[PDB]
Structures are given as structure tokens and as C-alpha cells.
């Protein structure tokens, strides 16, 4: 009927009425209540009268979700979960291998076009793909009384002792933090520094976060009228367009290749080599270049890296850096009837291991791809090769995209 | 029809039907895409890896033919709310599909000062989506002719009639033109109610062109998209001139709110503010991006509100101010401009239903029949207000060294 | 007056007269950079570092108030001459003022290059030179209005109307604004005649901006420029939306004169512009930077025909192209696009008799009476022109292997 | 050797290159007087050379060197600003400009620094670059030579190559970049108080041949592929810093701000932050955060032999203003200057004049104790009196004070 105070369990009823008794504020319910689900029903429930059109959450699934693995690191205030559709792409033959490409996406055509453009590589020998570089990057802002002292700490950091103390109190902060270089950036008496280092299989911006802490503490060791002013002062950099990302790297750089057989171009993607280079020029070059592009020169390798992304468990908004991709496409053959095409993505910001990578839905996505957790005999491994996975998919894309848009084809679909 | 499960699997197989084709070939969508995972387990290193991924009883009747293909499931995304989010006196209760630990957190945090500083106000700058295609013609003497042309009032008049006959919506408005030698960089804007819009401008670029074309028949039209426009990749024309919905923010957070809410102060705040969001930005050699997190609220309420989460790329354009403000300059003062908000309320995974849950939730679900448009750049504004708020709550963690604390 | 640069030097070291002054005072130009050489020499570690700064027989008459202050002498720049440029079936014989060697003879071997192969054809795509200040209002609501009205047919007439009120040749064109929380960024643009008209554009926004605050006299005008313009700092504004005047090049080498001429191949070319001038330009991250050297070129003609060699940052800023073409695909086809080309033709060192002597070598001196701007522009062409012209040298000598040698 | 007329009757008929006219005629004088005379016909109005100069200027240095058909030369007028209290000592800083008040501003702005207890500088690093495309078989070939050319082993053989060059040749670091199966390399190395431009171009070429030994199959497309980048706006040179990086500072104290620029701390400040921070980032620069650096630098430039047009990479430059001081009221300054190209040696250095206003800085010539020095010490001094500059104009834009000077 109805009670009032703690004790056993309780009811919806009124569990909600010690949430306005302001003791168990929403966000908490897991805190006290037994079962996941119950919570997430409940301020489903509180969050629906807080509601104008509280019928809405009806059609908003949540029921019978493993929530144990959300709640505590991937989410607050779960009021459910949403679906996105899961399509499928290739068989992708990329390095003598063939892929199934889980997408989540809610675009028509993106996966049937990946699928059309994985078809192009697989008549056409296969793709090839090498991982440039890998590393991580955190760049905190520092201050120093005078840009003088800045000066100073920059030479210190860039003497090899300097970067060997910094590297140890680094590296002494996890089992994979090894510092790479460090890249060092002056503005009168702010102070950039850019960490890198690589990080296993995950993705690694924790991991270096409390890396670059540990680094800056001993750096102030040293230089102890110097300003800590945040451990991310945009240097990194993360989640927003960056010409230091695209120039420097970030993650995982990967170049990828392929040539696709002027009938498989003719056949397949319904065109022209000589037309797809007509367009990948003045549309990927000097169409990007007057839009005053930096790291654009591409056509939606967006489009392929957000699916993927959210099918894998990957932080879908690092769509911003590890999109950059330039994708390239040259004459080739006995003929130069065959298509070459390469696309070069300097800044994949990709893990396999922790963040989403811990639930289980996503991690049916990750070994559909064979890349789920932590590679134990060569850590690093499956980052580096579903970064890999990622670039050949964006070829694929590019090359089928571009096609329709060679042909003509677009508006149809 | 009956055919035992694998009887249409060895069916396909021995026939080679693309799996793809199930839908039309099989009856019921759950049958094909079941069926799909069978075949495609088969050609998995472990046949029983889709043993976590759902796809039963969904509603795929949406779906294919409109929003993916090869279908094999669904991707369950935490959906978290944050808020209320008092803007423009009204309070929200924003959904953020998000796997991000303290994202959702954290822009409540943000969302919290706001609150308890007298609310936030936005207004929405200027609306109209983007198509730039590449067209080209024999000499640069020729480019040149036609962009004078495109810019007589008769000849934009032409272009415009075609264009806007378009649809009920498409009503062109200015047109951009640059020249890169014999190449000529069409920029169509056009509004386009609560739709996102990036079809229908498609439909009328190239009804356009068309018409265009009549004119200059030695024209050749190379693509639709020839990146002017820009559409997902990064860009100073979409930050410079704008794509989509344009829209300003800003609140006053009371000294006391940001020593209690936030847990910092002012002047710290925007002791971080400029020399990360600024300073730092330019360092990077960023264009566009003068924020400190503006993506992950984006992304969030994006996947979460059935939006293209690719768009995030140019969507997230921002940047962020903060003075100081008040009698004693202890109130921190904060806005947030975002020049290329990319979003719509009606088509795309606007039309799936879970989708549509939180955009009622926002009471922004489908087209706004008494003022088309209405919808849209009301979600537009949400978007920016929660961005505010979240670029309150983590600038302040960042100003009070709780990044490796709260994660 | 006239006492003796002995003691005249006196006073002045009784610093009753400040060494940038000496004008005001001796009234004799040459003298008073004259004295002022001497009062500087005793100030140098080197007192007679100066021995070989030219500054007799100068006409100091035009310089003095108007180019330059505490004048002290000048600076002899060597100047060469590329050409003839057939460019829109003329022929320019550009002067370039320049140090470094083979400039001027890549620009000719350009030129030649070009001459042979039926000329060059050019168009000024756009006109209007800039001004962007930055305005403040109490709340970015505010701000939001203010754009708003700029916006309404009605507010921009008033603004215009005042803006053109400034000068006989302001005509403000469009209106840009761009907001920034409780900032307003505001571009003004309007055409100059043959006038660079940087100082033209500026009375005209001030006068602009007192209107506009007679409507919202809760703005703050914090500084007629915000960097918005831009001016002399590299801009993806100035390379999308132009700034100056905006024009097109091209030309078609005949695959006889490239082999000759420039000591390659069409093929070569254009294998070596896309790698080098978009892939190369793009790896750098680059805005507005798709071309070799054109800054080389404009640099030259603009100190020779007096111009702000400053204003080489924006002014430089072009995309050159290269297809193949003809019957074979043998003949080379190159285009050069420059957004913001800030020139004029009128004003600054314009007025100096040397500058002018380039200025003249091209007919492009002075006002264009009967049609304004018409010089500026054309001056804005050649510019163009012959950027092109070192473009393809260059860019083919690099393609030779011929840079080092 | 005899007459004139017939020189060129001999010349029209024989048709000899105008270009050449030095390898016929006694004195370079007269092959510039004859090239002049044989041009004039060639002009809309043959009387157009009148005041374009030429007489005794000493084209010797200048032949074969640092311009090609010379008809004369430029005189550009050249103010001084100064002292510029820098790092302990004074400049006067020698300015060739055509722009009035820029001498004047950059003057009050070193007025302002010298009452303030003068201004710090710090070269951060040294390295021109080069920057060349080179082209492989596939992408994976590409990705092999990048590997290679990072392991020790492999930069030690290429480095060995590089330094074989020249004395001074001392490749740094190498930073490669991949686009498919092209590899851009920047090569970096010091060059003493040489800009270095030349240097590098003989090392790199040196290199990329040891390089080419090891990938038989690579092709060396172009010693330059925008890469370095020289010349045009490039995020690299800003991100990675090419030829001197150096930092600038000083404290204006308040009372200076309010007596010599005319002002507030409080409101330099506020315009810094709005203009050349959110200003440029909503012009979408990259390098460009500061009011005119340019200005500034093209004058020293021009002033000192520099090369003129290097000015596009070299005014990269972010201008910061804190309040400072026991009540704030005092105004920190800096100024960070990550490109400068600069050289004390060879190029329009060699010319006299020049070399006048050089060692009016005490910087000409080759520094033989500490080589690199006066490069580097000249650099200091362009960051300096940039400050100096951005200081003066700040104020003016602060105060209202522009447009009437
Ligand atoms: C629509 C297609 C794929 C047809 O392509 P098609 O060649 O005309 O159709 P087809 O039946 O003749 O070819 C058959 C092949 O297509 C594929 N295919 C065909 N249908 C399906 C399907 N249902 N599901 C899966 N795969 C499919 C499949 O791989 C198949 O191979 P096969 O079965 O013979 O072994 C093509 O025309 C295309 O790729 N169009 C463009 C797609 C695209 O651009 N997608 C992204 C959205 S565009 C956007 O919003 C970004 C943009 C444009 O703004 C960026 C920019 O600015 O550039
Ligand atoms: C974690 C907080 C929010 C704690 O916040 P707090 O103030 O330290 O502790 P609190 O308990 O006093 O705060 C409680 C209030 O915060 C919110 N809050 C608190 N806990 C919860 C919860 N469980 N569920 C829901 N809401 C919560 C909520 O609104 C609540 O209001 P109240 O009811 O108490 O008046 C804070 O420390 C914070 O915001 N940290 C930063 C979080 C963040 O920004 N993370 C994601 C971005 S990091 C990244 O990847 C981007 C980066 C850094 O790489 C980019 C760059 O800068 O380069
Ligand atoms: C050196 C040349 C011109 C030889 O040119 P050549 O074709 O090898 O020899 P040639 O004598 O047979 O050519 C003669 C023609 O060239 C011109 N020419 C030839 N000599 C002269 C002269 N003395 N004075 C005037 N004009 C001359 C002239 O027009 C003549 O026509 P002709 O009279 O026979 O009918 C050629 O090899 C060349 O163009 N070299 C490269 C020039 C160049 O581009 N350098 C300046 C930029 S380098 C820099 O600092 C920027 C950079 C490159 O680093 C930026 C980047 O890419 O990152
Ligand atoms: C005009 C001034 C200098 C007057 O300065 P003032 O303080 O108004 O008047 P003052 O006579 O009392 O000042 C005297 C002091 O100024 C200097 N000074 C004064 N006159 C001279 C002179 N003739 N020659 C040399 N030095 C001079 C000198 O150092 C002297 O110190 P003192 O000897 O008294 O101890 C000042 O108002 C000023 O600096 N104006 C602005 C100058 C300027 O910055 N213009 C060039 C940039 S405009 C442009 O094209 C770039 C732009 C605008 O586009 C950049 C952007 O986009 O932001």
C-alpha cells in the first residue's frame, strides 16, 4: 500500500519517495538497491514524470541487459540502452586474410557500398596494409614564471638525462607505459608537452593520463616554481581537429594499398579508372584543399571508421582524428587501365581492450574480427591489426563511394 | 517458405544467392538475418562468435531498406540522461547513448551549475545544409564566365527555381562559388525544414546543375560532392561560413556554484580556458576546434537521438569563452559557439522508434507541422546548451586536477 | 636652420629635439637624414657601420611623412626584367625587385615557355578589399541580434549608406559577420578604384561601427581590426572567401616547348605538381598553399612596384594546376587561382618616382581615370601572369632534376 | 667595346639575348644602360624608366649572383627604431619600409620596452629543413624505407651522406611522412649563420642518393615536395619549427602603458585575447595569432639582405598579454616566433648596403668564434622588435587610435 523509512527491499511505491527525501539521489540507486535492472526501472520511472511527454521512454528498450558491466565505468544514469543496426561487409581481403567488417550504422547504402568497394579489392588481388607508427599522446599545459624558465625546462626535457628521468617516472606507471619521444611546444611562458607512448592493446588515454601525471610531478621535482595548469591542454590531441594529429600522428598510422582491374572497375564498380582519378583529384585534392581542409582529403572515411567504431566498442567520438585519412588514386597496369589506390590514416585512435571493449555485445563485433582483448603473446597486436582492418575498410569505402560518385550514381544511391 | 533452416542455407549456397538477397528471398526479417549469422559463422575463425550479439525480435521492418544492409544485429549503446538542462527557460532531459564513464556524469555536473545560475539562453544563428559539387569546363576563361554568370540576380534565379522545384522544402538560399583553375566549386544552401537535409540538397543540387548545364553545355559535371560542401571531414569553409544549424550559448555561474558545484574557481577556470582552449588549440594548429571536449556530447546525444554519428566530425566545430562576470568578477561567465551543427528530427535513424524515444524525451520527434524547422534547430540548441554544459564540468575538473580522479 | 651639423647636433644632444624630428625642424630633407646618420654612428659599436647606406640625392620630399619615419637613408634593391608575358595577347615586360639569383631568369625562362605557346589568358574572379573589427555586446543574445539586423536588408542599407558616405570610391559590397559568444566579428567589403585601399576600408568601417552604435549603443567597439580582415596574417578566410582580388590563370605549353623550353616532360610535370603541390602541400598542412613559389614572384613585383611586401602573406596564397592536353596528351595545361591578391595602383609607395618608373614599364601607373580599378586589376593579372610563369620553370626544373646546379 | 646604337642594331640583328648583355660590354653599367635603352622601345611609353635609378650602384656584386637582367635597382626607404633594450644591450633596429608609421610605431614600441627594463629573448632551436618527395613501387615499399630510415643504423648512413656536404652541414633529426607509395623526408640540419636554404638542398640531394643505393627502385621525384615547407603557409613549419624558433618577453609597467601607449593594461589585454585569439581562430589561421608581425619582419628583412619573400614562414608568430605585476596593472608581453628564416651570410648579405644595416646590428658577416651566432642573434632581435611592434599597434587598436595614426 504505501510506508514510510529504510528496511527490506521496499517497493518502487515509495523507494522513490527517499530519492525526494534527497538520501538517495537517482544516480545512486544501484548504490543501495540488490538488482540493476530494478534501478534503471525506477528512474526510468522517477526521469518519467520529470517527463512533458512521459510515454516516451515506452518504445526505449533496457529491459534484460547485462548492466553489472556497464554500470561502474561505461555509463550514469542508465535509463536503458539504443540499438543500432548491425550490417556486415566483405569478405575483406586484406593482408592474405580475409574479414568480415561489422558496421553499426543507421545509413542506408553505407554498408552495401562497403560491401560493393570490399567486392572491387577481392577480384583485385587482395589489399595490403602496414602500421606506420603506434603511440598515444597526452599534452599538458605547464607555466613557468618567465618564458626564460619555459625555455629552460625545454632544453632540460630535450637533454637525454632530462628525457630519461621523465621517461622512468613515466614508464613506472604501468606494465605497457613506455615513452616514446616528447614532443615540446613554447608559448611565451606556457609550456606544451607532448607524451607518447605506446599502450598494449588498449587504446591507451588513461593509461597515458596517469602516465603524464606521474611524469609531471618529477618534472616539478626539478623545476618547482613551475604551474601544472592541466594534464590536457589541448596539445594531445583529443577529440577535436588537429593539424599536430595529422602531421605528428596519434594512435595507430596505417597505410593501406590495393589495384583494382580495369574490368572489375568497369564491372564492379561501374566506371572508369581513368574517371575515378578524374574525381579522386579534383574532389579528394583540390576540392578538400578549397574547402581549406587539414587532414580531409578523403571522401566519408567518417562514414566507415563511426561504424566500425560503435559495432567494435570504440570511443565513437574519436571519429574526429581517426578519420583523417588521404586516399589516392593512380593510373597503374601494362595498360594504366588498372586502378591503384592507397589510403594513409596517420591518426587511428583504436584499442581492444577495456572502455566498451568490456561488454559483450561489442566484443562479439571484436572476434568477428578475431582482435577482442588483449593480445597475450604480442601485446599490441590486435589494436595494431583491427587499426589495420579499420584503414582496408576505409578503402573499400572510399573506392566504392567514389565509384558512385564517378558514375553518376549517387542520387540513385 | 517451410524449407528446413539449412535447406535455404545449402539453397543459397549451392545457387550462390548473396546474402544480402535473404530479405527479399526469405519471408520475416528475423528469418534472413538468422539465417545471415548462420552462413557468416561459418566463415568466422569462431563460429560462435556472434553468440553476444542480439538481433532477435527487432524491429528490422525499419531497418533494411532504409538504414542498413546485410543486417546480422543489433548494438546495444548505454543510454544515460543528464540535466534538467535549463535553457531558454525550459528544462530538458538530455539522452546520451554513451560508453564513456562520467561523460554522462560529468554533463550533468555541468548541467547542475547551470542550473542553479539562472539558466542558460541560445539562439540559433543561421540554418541551411550543404552541397558542393566539382564541375569543370574547357578553360579557366570558361569556370570564370560561369561564376560571374551564377552570380547575376537572373542567373541565381534560374539555378534557384531548379533547385527549390526540388521539394516542398528546398528553398535555395545563397550560393558560394570558387575557382581552382578550369574547376568550379559549387556551394548550394538551402534550408530544408526538420530534415537533416543531406538528400534532399542532393536532389536539388542536381536538378540544378542540370538546368546549369543547359547553358553551358560544354560544362561536365565531375560530382554531386566534390568536398565544398564540406560533408564529414574537416574543414574551415563549414567553421568560416557555416553548415547546418549555427548556434550561440552562454550562462553565468555563480561564484559560490563554481566553488561548490564545479569545485574551483573562476579565475581558474579561465586561467584554463584560454590557455587550453585557445592558446593550446592554436598550438595544435587546430581549426575549429576551441573546445575541450565538445565531441563527446555530441556523439552521445547523436547516436542516442538517431543522428548521423559521423557528422560528428564537422558537428562538433566549437569554441568556448569564459570571462569574468559579476560585481566582484567572480562569477564566471561562459558561451559556446558551434557554426556547423549537422542534425535533423524527421528521416534517417529518426524513423527507427527507439530512436525517436529520445527525441520525444526532448519533445523534438518528428517534422514541426506549424513551423517547419522548429524541431530541428530546437534539438540544434540542445545540442549546444549540453555541449556548455559539459565544457563547464570538465574544464573545471581539468582546473582542479580531478581528471585522474574521477576516471 | 642653418647653423652647422656641428651644433645643430648640440641641441639635440640637449635631446631639446628628439632625432625623429629633425625634419619639422631643418627644413632640407637630406640634411636632416643627414645629421640624424651622424647623431646614429656615434650611437653604433661600429660608428662607421654605415659607410655603405646610400641616402644622398634621394627625393627624401615624398618619403617623409608618408613611407617612412626616422629615415636615415635607403635601401638599393636590385631589379630585373622578366618577359615579354604574353598574357591576355599583350606582352608585359615585368620588373622584379629582387636578391636572389635565377628568380628573375626562371621567371623568364617562364615567360618564354608561355610566349610559345600561344600566350596566356587571365581573369579577375572577384574585387574587394577588407576590413573585420571586432565588436563586444553585454550577452551573446545581444550579439545574436546585432547579426541578425547587419543581416535585414534595411540594417545593411544604413550601414552601407554610412560606410559609403567615407570616400568617393567606397561602394561596400557584401557583409560577413561571424559571432563568438558576446563577440561580433564583423568583415566589411568594398571595392577602392586603384587604390590598395587598406586605409580607404578603414574610415569607412569606423564611420560604419559609430552608425551601428547609434542602434545598439550597448556595443563596445573594441578594435576596428579583430584579425577577421585579415590582414598580413595567414587566414583560411582570405584563401575561401578572398581578400583583395581574387583571379585565374592558364596557359598551354606545347609539348615541343616543354622538352625544349623547359628541359623535360608534360607527363614529368604534372607527375611532380600533384605529388609536390597538393599531396606535399597537404602533408605539410597547408591553407592555401598548393603552388611552388609564387610567393617568390610576388614579393618581387611588389617591391618593385611598390607595394606592402608584407602583404606577400596573403597575397601569395594560390593552387596551381596541371593536366595533360592536346591531341596526344603531349601538351601541357597549367592554371594558377589567387584569392586575395592585395594590390593597388595608387597611394603608398605608389607615389615614389621609382615605383612608379615599374609602375609605368607595365602602363598600370596611377589612377585609371576612365575606368577605376581598372589599373589595380590589371596590375592584379600580371601578378597572376607571371606567377604562373615561375611556376611552370620551376616546377619543371624540379622536375629535371635541376634546382642544386 | 665601341658605341651604343650599334651595339644594339648588332644585338636586334644578331638578335643577341638581352640577358646577356653583361658577357659583351666592358663595364656591367653600360649593359644595364644598353638593356634599358633596348627595353624602352619595347614599352607603351619608352619614357617610363626616367626615375627608375640605376648609375653607380655596383652591379658587380649583384651579376651572376642575386638578379638576372638587372635594368637597375630599387631604392626602399629605410627608417631606424631603437634602442631596443634586449637581452641586456641595444640595437638600433635598421627598417626598409614604405609604410608611414610602422618606423614610428615600432619606435614607441621600443620606448615602451626601454622604460620597462628592457625585454628577454631565447633562440629555442636551429634547423633549416628540406623536405623531398620520393616515390616507391607500393605502399609497403614506402613503409620499409620509413622503418629503415628510423632505425639508428639507417639515419647514420644517410646522416653521414648529408654532412659529407659541407662544413657546417649537420643533419638533426628526420622527420619522414607516407602518402601511399610516396615518402616525404624532411631533413634537418644547422648551417652556422648561413640561412641555409642552399645547404640543405646539396645535403639532402647528397643523402637521398646514399639513400637510393640501399631502394634501387625509388624514385627521387622532387628534392623539394612542399615538405620543408619554404615559402608557403604551412601548419609544419608552426608544429615543428623551421630555420630559428625563439621567445620574447617583457614587463611594461603600468604607468608606460598609460604614458607612452597610450592606455590600459586592462584594455591591451582585453583586445589581445579578442583579436589576435579569437579573431584568427575564427579566421581560421594556423600561425598566425598575433597583430602584424609582418610588418616588422619584411622591413628587417628588406633592411638586412634577408630573403623578402621568406616572410610568408617567417612571421609565424602567437603574441600573448597577461596583467602582471603587484596590482596587475603592469602588462606581461611575449611573443613566440617558431619559423624565422634568417642567415648573416651569403645572398643579398653579400651586397654592401645591406651589409650596412648588419653590422649596424653588429650581426654581419660569418660569426667566426661561435659560428651560427649572428644568425641567431638576429633572429633575437626580429622576435625583439616584433614584440616591440605588436606592443605600439596593440595599444593604438586599444586606444582608438588608428585610423588619424
Ligand atoms: C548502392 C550501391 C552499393 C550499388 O552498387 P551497384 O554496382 O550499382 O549494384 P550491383 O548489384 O550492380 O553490384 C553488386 C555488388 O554491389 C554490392 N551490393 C549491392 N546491393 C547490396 C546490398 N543490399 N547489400 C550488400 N551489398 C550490396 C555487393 O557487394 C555486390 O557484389 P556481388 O553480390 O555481385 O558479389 C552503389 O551504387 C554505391 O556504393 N552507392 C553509393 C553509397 C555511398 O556513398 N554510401 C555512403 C553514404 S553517402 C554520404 O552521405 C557521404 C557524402 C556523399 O556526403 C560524402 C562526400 O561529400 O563525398
Ligand atoms: C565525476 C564528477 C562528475 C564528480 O563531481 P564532483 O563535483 O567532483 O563530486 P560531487 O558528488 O560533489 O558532484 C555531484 C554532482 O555531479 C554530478 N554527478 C556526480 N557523480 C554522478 C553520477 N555517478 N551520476 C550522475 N551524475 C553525477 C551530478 O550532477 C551531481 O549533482 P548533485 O545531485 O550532487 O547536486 C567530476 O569529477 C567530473 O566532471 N570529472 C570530469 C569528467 C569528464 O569530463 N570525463 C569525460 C571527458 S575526459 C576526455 O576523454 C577528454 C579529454 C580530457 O581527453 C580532452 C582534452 O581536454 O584534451
Ligand atoms: C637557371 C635556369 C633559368 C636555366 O634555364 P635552362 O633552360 O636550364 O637553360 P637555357 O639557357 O637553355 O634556357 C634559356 C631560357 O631561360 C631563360 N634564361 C636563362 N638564363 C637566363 C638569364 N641569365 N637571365 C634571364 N633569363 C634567362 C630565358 O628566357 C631563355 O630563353 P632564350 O633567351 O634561350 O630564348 C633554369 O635551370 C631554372 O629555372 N632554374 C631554377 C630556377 C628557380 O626556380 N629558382 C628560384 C626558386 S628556388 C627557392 O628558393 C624556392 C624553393 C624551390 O626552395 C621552394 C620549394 O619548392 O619548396
Ligand atoms: C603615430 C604614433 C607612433 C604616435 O604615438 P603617440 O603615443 O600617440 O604620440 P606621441 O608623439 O606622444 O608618442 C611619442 C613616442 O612615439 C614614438 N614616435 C612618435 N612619432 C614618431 C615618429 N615620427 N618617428 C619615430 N618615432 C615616433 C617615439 O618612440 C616617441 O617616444 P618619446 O621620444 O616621446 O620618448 C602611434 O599613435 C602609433 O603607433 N600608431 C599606430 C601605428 C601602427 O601600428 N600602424 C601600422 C599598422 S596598420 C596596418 O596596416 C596593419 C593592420 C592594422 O592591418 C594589422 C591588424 O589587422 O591588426
Same mark, same amino acid.
Given at each position: 500500500?504505501?510506508?514510510?523509512?529504510?528496511?527490506?527491499?521496499?517497493?518502487?511505491?515509495?523507494?522513490?519517495?527517499?530519492?525526494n527525501?534527497?538520501?538517495?539521489?537517482?544516480?545512486?540507486?544501484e548504490?543501495?538497491?540488490?538488482?540493476?535492472?530494478?534501478?534503471?526501472?525506477?528512474?526510468?520511472?522517477?526521469?518519467?514524470?520529470?517527463?512533458?511527454?512521459?510515454?516516451?521512454?515506452?518504445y526505449?528498450?533496457?529491459?534484460?541487459?547485462?548492466?553489472?558491466?556497464?554500470?561502474?565505468?561505461?555509463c550514469?544514469?542508465?535509463?536503458?540502452?539504443?540499438?543500432?543496426?548491425?550490417? $556486415?561487409?566483405? +569478405?575483406?581481403?586484406? *593482408?592474405?586474410? /580475409?574479414?568480415?567488417?561489422?558496421?553499426? !550504422?543507421? #545509413? =542506408?547504402?553505407? %554498408?552495401?557500398?562497403?560491401?560493393?568497394?570490399?567486392?572491387?579489392?577481392?577480384?583485385?588481388?587482395?589489399?595490403?596494409?602496414?602500421?606506420?607508427?603506434?603511440?598515444?599522446?597526452?599534452?599538458?599545459? $605547464?607555466?613557468? +614564471?618567465r618564458?626564460? *624558465?619555459?625555455? /629552460?625546462?625545454?632544453?632540460?626535457?630535450? !637533454?637525454? #638525462? =632530462?628525457?630519461? %628521468?621523465?621517461?622512468?617516472?613515466?614508464?613506472?606507471?604501468?606494465?605497457?607505459?613506455?615513452?616514446?619521444?616528447?614532443?615540446?611546444?613554447?608559448?611565451?611562458?606556457?609550456?606544451?608537452?607532448?607524451?607518447?607512448?605506446?599502450?598494449?592493446?588498449?587504446?591507451?588515454?588513461?593509461?597515458?593520463?596517469?602516465g603524464?601525471?606521474?611524469?609531471?610531478?618529477?618534472?616539478?621535482?626539478?623545476?618547482?616554481?613551475m604551474?601544472?595548469?592541466?594534464?590536457?591542454?589541448?596539445?594531445?590531441?583529443?577529440?577535436?581537429?588537429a593539424?599536430?594529429?595529422?602531421?605528428?600522428?596519434?594512435?595507430?598510422?596505417?597505410?593501406?594499398?590495393?589495384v583494382?582491374?580495369?574490368?572489375?572497375?568497369?564491372?564492379?564498380?561501374?566506371?572508369?579508372?581513368?574517371?575515378?582519378?578524374?574525381?579522386?583529384?579534383?574532389?579528394?585534392?583540390?576540392?578538400?584543399?578549397?574547402?581549406?581542409?587539414?587532414?580531409?582529403?578523403?571522401?566519408?572515411?567518417?562514414?566507415?571508421?563511426?561504424?566500425?567504431?560503435?559495432?567494435?566498442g570504440?570511443?565513437?567520438?574519436?571519429?574526429?582524428?581517426?578519420?583523417?585519412?588521404?586516399?589516392?588514386?593512380?593510373?597503374?597496369?601494362?595498360?594504366?587501365?588498372?586502378?591503384?589506390?592507397?589510403?594513409?590514416?596517420?591518426?587511428?585512435?583504436?584499442?581492444?581492450?577495456?572502455?566498451?571493449?568490456?561488454?559483450?555485445?561489442?566484443?562479439?563485433?571484436?572476434?568477428?574480427?578475431?582482435?577482442?582483448?588483449?593480445?597475450k603473446?604480442?601485446?599490441?597486436?590486435?589494436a595494431?591489426?583491427?587499426?589495420?582492418?579499420?584503414?582496408?575498410?576505409?578503402?573499400?569505402?572510399?573506392?566504392?563511394?567514389?565509384?558512385?560518385?564517378?558514375?553518376?550514381?549517387?542520387?540513385?544511391?
Amino acid at each position: 500500500g504505501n510506508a514510510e523509512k529504510g528496511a527490506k527491499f521496499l517497493s518502487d511505491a515509495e523507494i522513490i519517495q527517499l530519492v525526494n527525501a534527497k538520501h538517495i539521489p537517482a544516480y545512486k540507486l544501484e548504490t543501495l538497491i540488490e538488482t540493476h535492472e530494478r534501478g534503471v526501472s525506477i528512474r526510468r520511472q522517477l526521469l518519467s514524470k520529470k517527463l512533458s511527454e512521459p510515454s516516451s521512454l515506452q518504445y526505449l528498450p533496457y529491459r534484460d541487459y547485462n548492466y553489472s558491466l556497464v554500470m561502474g565505468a561505461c555509463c550514469e544514469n542508465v535509463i536503458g540502452y539504443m540499438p543500432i543496426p548491425v550490417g $556486415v561487409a566483405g +569478405p575483406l581481403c586484406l *593482408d592474405e586474410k /580475409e574479414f568480415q567488417v561489422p558496421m553499426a !550504422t543507421t #545509413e =542506408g547504402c553505407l %554498408v552495401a557500398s562497403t560491401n560493393r568497394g570490399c567486392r572491387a579489392i577481392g577480384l583485385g588481388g587482395g589489399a595490403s596494409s602496414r602500421v606506420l607508427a603506434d603511440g598515444m599522446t597526452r599534452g599538458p599545459v $605547464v607555466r613557468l +614564471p618567465r618564458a626564460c *624558465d619555459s625555455a /629552460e625546462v625545454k632544453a632540460w626535457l630535450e !637533454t637525454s #638525462e =632530462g628525457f630519461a %628521468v621523465i621517461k622512468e617516472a613515466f614508464d613506472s606507471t604501468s606494465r605497457f607505459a613506455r615513452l616514446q619521444k616528447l614532443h615540446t611546444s613554447i608559448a611565451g611562458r606556457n609550456l606544451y608537452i607532448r607524451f607518447q607512448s605506446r599502450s598494449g592493446d588498449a587504446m591507451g588515454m588513461n593509461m597515458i593520463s596517469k602516465g603524464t601525471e606521474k611524469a609531471l610531478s618529477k618534472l616539478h621535482e626539478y623545476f618547482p616554481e613551475m604551474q601544472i595548469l592541466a594534464v590536457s591542454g589541448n596539445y594531445c590531441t583529443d577529440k577535436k581537429p588537429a593539424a599536430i594529429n595529422w602531421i605528428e600522428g596519434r594512435g595507430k598510422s596505417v597505410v593501406c594499398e590495393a589495384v583494382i582491374p580495369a574490368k572489375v572497375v568497369r564491372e564492379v564498380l561501374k566506371t572508369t579508372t581513368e574517371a575515378m582519378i578524374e574525381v579522386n583529384i579534383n574532389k579528394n585534392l583540390v576540392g578538400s584543399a578549397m574547402a581549406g581542409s587539414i587532414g580531409g582529403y578523403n571522401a566519408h572515411a567518417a562514414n566507415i571508421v563511426t561504424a566500425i567504431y560503435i559495432a567494435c566498442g570504440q570511443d565513437a567520438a574519436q571519429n574526429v582524428g581517426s578519420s583523417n585519412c588521404i586516399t589516392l588514386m593512380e593510373a597503374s597496369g601494362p595498360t594504366n587501365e588498372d586502378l591503384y589506390i592507397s589510403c594513409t590514416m596517420p591518426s587511428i585512435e583504436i584499442g581492444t581492450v577495456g572502455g566498451g571493449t568490456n561488454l559483450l555485445p561489442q566484443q562479439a563485433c571484436l572476434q568477428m574480427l578475431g582482435v577482442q582483448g588483449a593480445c597475450k603473446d604480442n601485446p599490441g597486436e590486435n589494436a595494431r591489426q583491427l587499426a589495420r582492418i579499420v584503414c582496408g575498410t576505409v578503402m573499400a569505402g572510399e573506392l566504392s563511394l567514389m565509384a558512385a560518385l564517378a558514375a553518376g550514381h549517387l542520387v540513385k544511391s
